[PDB]
Structure 1
Amino acid sequence: NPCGGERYLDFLRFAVFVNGESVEENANVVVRLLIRKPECFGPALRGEG
């Protein structure tokens, strides 16, 4: 579902970037969660295939 994925990614973008600068805490948490659930990267960035 790329369409819904884009909406959730937009919310995460607004959560991690504030006033032209990256919020380090939120950025690190988001990166850790994304790598712990690799399916969030879409089929293209799947490790194996």
Structure 2
Amino acid sequence: CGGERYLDFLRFAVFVNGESVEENANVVVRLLIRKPECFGPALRGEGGS
């Protein structure tokens, strides 16, 4: 529940209006995979599941 309601802010900060802001998407994508312990690392392919 905590993770689902936490990244919803980023969903609004990267999809401005029907488009993808390249000035922030590139930074966000790097940060998502900067730490492997993200996006539910237990069962998202990071931990091997």
Name the count of aligned residue pairs.
Answer: 47
Q: Which has the higher contact order (CA 8 A, sep 6+)?
A: 1
Scaled by the length of structure 2, what TM-score is found? Answer: 0.73
Distance 1:45 1:34, change over 3 A: farther
TM-score normalized by structure 1? Answer: 0.73
| Greater share of residues in helix | 1
Give 5+ residue unaligned stretches, structure 1. none
Aligned in 2, Cα 1:42/1:14: closer, same or farther, shift over 3 Å? same
Q: Which runs of 5+ in 2 are unaligned?
A: none
Identical residues among aligned pairs (%): 98
